[PDB]
């Protein structure tokens, strides 16, 4: 039961289901102490049974319990764990992650097979903790807290920050992801080339594997952090290492429309 | 009484409790029929149950009576002005002791919480809870800066004497987590209360001198 920024209160549907069960349980205790007739006691016991049902699994038996003033069924414990919006598929089998970006993709014909064009301003946010350390290593900032303030305001960022960033990303790779990820070649690791602009540059030869053309497609950027994550991405997931198709064994990065036409 | 926060069966059970009370208090000597007297208790129980169980955040009975009266007064003014009354109209209608500030406070108090599972948009894949940040647990940046500050202060207190550093770590609650008064600290070291205030003031002054020579601790103060 949290208070939103505006001062309003937001609560979950479980509190309403718990309150109904407690309100009915307490009333039954009062009626039992009053020596009420069996008809009254039976109705309260039947209601208490239904209150537990609604809390455990709302709508499984009879009409769903709804919040007064609305027709939306209350969310029960079973609804929390079940379905495409349940805990399993929504929060355990998949999650939202930090050190991740997104932007429109354009074609980079000058890139090597293992390179991608990462915008400088995306790279600054994605690699921020690494950059703060590098700024502190050099004379750019006195400490990490001062360095973090510099990046907060765009007009406070000096030109030496970009030189330090070029050092932070050296050797490192990033994962480019396009949805839907039909096969494992829908995620690939590239060595970013910091570029001016706001769109990611994608190598022409990896577009078939990603199933990505350039009529408005967008891609996600993920930064593996530790040495294992970087070693795995640079060895197993690198674009220049996955040249054949795992399904048929035939080349999957091969000449395409404009390249075939020229040759 | 349906549509006021309680379901039909909940209203009946609250009414039944009033009917039980009417049986005990009823007097057949007066020659009044039972429904004449039992109707008072049945309505009383049903109405009280609404005032006590109809809101997630329970509001006392007297405050519910004020809220209901305030809503009734506004509706009558609304039908007569041909528009929603302002807090001044409502305050004047309510009577003595009421001003626009109180009317606004009562309306703010009578606001029901909004469910965290309310869908937004045509698709049933987004809810209110998906847009509400958690602001209790510290963030990785907050936790890191707290450890950085503690790490630097530990080095700064290293320049201090063996006792002077301990006095500050006690007078500022850096050991037990809670501050120790001059007398409470003195018992630990068996020194007088006035003496500790001298070393602590002197030890604190030295820390100021070092910071000016390095300025390695001014960033953490914001």
């Amino acid at each position: 039961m949290v208070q939103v920024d505006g001062g309003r209160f937001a609560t979950s549907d479980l509190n309403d289901l718990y309150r109904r069960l407690i309100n009915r349980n307490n009333r039954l205790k009062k009626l039992l102490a009053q020596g009420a007739p069996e008809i009254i006691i039976r109705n309260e016991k039947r209601m208490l049974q239904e209150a537990v049902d609604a809390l455990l699994d709302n709508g499984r038996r009879g009409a769903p319990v709804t919040n007064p003033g609305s027709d939306r069924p209350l969310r029960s414990l079973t609804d929390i764990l079940s379905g495409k919006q349940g805990r399993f598929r929504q929060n355990l089998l998949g999650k939202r992650v930090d050190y991740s970006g997104r932007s429109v993709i354009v074609v980079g014909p000058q890139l090597k097979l293992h390179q991608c064009g990462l915008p400088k301003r995306m790279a600054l946010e994605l690699f921020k903790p690494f950059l703060l350390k590098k700024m502190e290593e050099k004379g750019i900032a006195p400490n990490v807290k001062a360095a973090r303030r510099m990046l907060e305001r765009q007009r406070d960022i000096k030109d030496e920050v970009w030189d330090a960033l070029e050092e932070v990303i050296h050797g490192k790779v990033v994962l480019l992801n396009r949805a839907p990820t039909l096969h494992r070649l829908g995620i690939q690791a590239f060595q970013p080339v910091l570029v001016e602009g706001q769109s990611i540059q994608l190598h022409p030869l990896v577009c078939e594997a990603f199933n990505a053309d350039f009529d408005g497609d967008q891609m996600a950027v993920h930064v593996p952090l530790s040495s294992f994550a970087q070693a795995e991405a640079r060895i197993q997931m690198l674009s220049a290492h996955n040249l054949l198709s795992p399904a048929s064994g035939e080349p999957l990065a091969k000449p395409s429309r404009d390249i075939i036409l020229g040759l | 009484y349906t549509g006021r926060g309680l379901s039909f069966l909940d209203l009946i059970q609250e009414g039944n409790q009033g009917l039980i009370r009417a049986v005990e208090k009823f007097e057949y000597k007066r020659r009044f029929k039972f429904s004449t007297y039992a109707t008072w208790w049945i309505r009383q129980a049903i109405n009280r149950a609404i005032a006590d169980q109809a809101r997630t955040i329970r509001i006392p009975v007297h405050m519910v009576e004020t809220i209901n009266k305030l809503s009734r007064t506004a509706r009558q003014l609304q039908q007569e002005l041909g528009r929603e009354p302002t807090y001044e109209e409502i305050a004047e209608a309510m009577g003595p002791g009421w001003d626009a500030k109180r009317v606004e406070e009562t309306l703010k108090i009578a606001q029901e919480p909004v469910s965290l599972e309310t869908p937004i948009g045509d698709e049933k894949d987004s809810f209110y809870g998906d847009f509400i940040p958690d602001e209790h647990l510290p963030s990785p940046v907050d936790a890191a800066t707290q450890s950085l500050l503690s790490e630097e202060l530990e080095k700064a207190l290293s320049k201090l004497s063996e006792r002077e550093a301990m006095v500050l770590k006690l007078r500022k609650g850096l050991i037990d987590g809670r501050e120790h008064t001059l007398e409470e600290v003195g018992a630990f070291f068996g020194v007088t209360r006035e003496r500790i205030r001298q070393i602590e003031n002197k030890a604190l002054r030295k820390l100021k001198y070092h910071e000016s020579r390095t300025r390695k601790l001014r960033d953490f103060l914001d």
């Binding site: 008809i39 039976r42 109705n43 039947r46 209601m47 009879g62 | 039909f8 069966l9 009946i12």
Partner: peptide, 15 residues
């Protein structure tokens, strides 16, 4: 009506 708690109660008080 078994599936309807209200109808079930009304039937009981009608006895």
């Amino acid at each position: 009506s078994t599936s309807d708690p209200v109808r079930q109660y009304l039937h009981e008080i009608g006895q």
